């Protein structure tokens, strides 16, 4: 939505060398990011985007909040795919990035791509899910990792985050079959989303 700062979490994996999506998942994600930046920027150009990865054995900030479209892009040129996303720590590292903003009017939002089944514990992540909304952070989970035969720990995470709050958590699952990952995500409500106050 408008007046919004977004940390996009890109899942870095060997699961995204898979050619299910086009013509790996990673090369599909390059296109996707560019699209997302313009969507938000043309809704309101006081929005900013930060980017972290899972790459490494620990998450890392590739870009702090910047109004620069090219800095986000440069970040993807730097990132490495042999790393594995660990979601528990990535949420916590995003929360700190979301304290720093261009203006404090910018709302707090996480967008997370999932390309691997997550093997962090459910009860562990349910603490974190409820930490988010105290900080006023909601999380949109684009899911295409936990649908390669895996349970939805996610169902619980999204309900725990939702509350009266104009930041509203969303669960999106994206058709894994060829229709172009980026097309579906761009076409999916992301600037037509609603609050919950």
């Amino acid at each position: 939505m408008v007046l919004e700062a977004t940390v996009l979490v890109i899942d870095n994996s060997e699961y995204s060398r898979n050619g299910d999506f086009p013509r790996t998942r990673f090369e599909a994600q390059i296109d996707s990011v560019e699209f997302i930046f313009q969507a938000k920027r043309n809704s309101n150009p006081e929005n900013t985007v930060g980017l972290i990865s899972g790459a490494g054995a620990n998450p890392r900030v590739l870009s702090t909040f910047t109004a620069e479209f090219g800095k986000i892009l440069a970040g993807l040129h730097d990132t490495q795919i042999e790393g594995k996303l660990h979601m528990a720590t990535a949420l916590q590292i995003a929360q700190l990035t979301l304290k720093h903003r261009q203006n404090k009017v910018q709302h707090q939002r996480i967008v997370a791509f999932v390309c691997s089944p997550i093997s962090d514990s459910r009860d562990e992540l349910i603490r974190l899910a409820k930490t988010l909304k105290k900080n006023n952070v909601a999380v949109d989970i684009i899911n295409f990792g936990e649908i390669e035969q895996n349970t939805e720990l996610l169902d619980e995470f999204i309900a725990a985050v939702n509350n009266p709050q104009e930041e509203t958590s969303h669960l999106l699952t994206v058709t894994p079959g060829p229709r172009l990952l980026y097309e579906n995500i761009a076409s999916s409500p992301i600037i037509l989303e609603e609050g919950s106050s």
Partner: protein, 192 residues
Amino acid sequence: EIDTILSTLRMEADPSLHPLFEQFEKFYEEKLWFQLSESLTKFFDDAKSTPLRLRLYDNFVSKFYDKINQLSVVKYLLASLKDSKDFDESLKYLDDLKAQFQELDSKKQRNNGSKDHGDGILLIDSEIARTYLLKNDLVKARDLLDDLEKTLDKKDSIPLRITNSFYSTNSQYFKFKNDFNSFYYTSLLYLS
């Protein structure tokens, strides 16, 4: 295309290596090629010296070079020709495959910009030196050993894999020399 070749190898293969064969066909079709990496590793452990190993590997390397991990792909190749008792066969096959990856990294390395493929070339070179030692030539292996050694120092992050292969070359060289201690120090570094 490759479905046919796989099917002949399965029938030829053991009834215990048969269900592993099935898995290759499925993952290739499905484009889930990280799981394809998993099924190949399982197979090759109790197929090391069975002759299906090398034939299977020729099929998959020809198709995919980087949509299935580069480091995995080479690490299969080196073991296959260690078990190969024809050193003249070993030398050309490494030499041919080394050529492919060097050609590859002009295009893939910059576009993908997040996977390097030059690291594989180094792993291959270790075995070429070792084919000389299998042929009992110490000097040729040594000139490649010197190149490997400087190159390790040059990278300022080193995969475990590369420093292992580099020591493995050294260790085999020293016991053709019959020197005990030199072997010992090399193997200590390598085992760790």
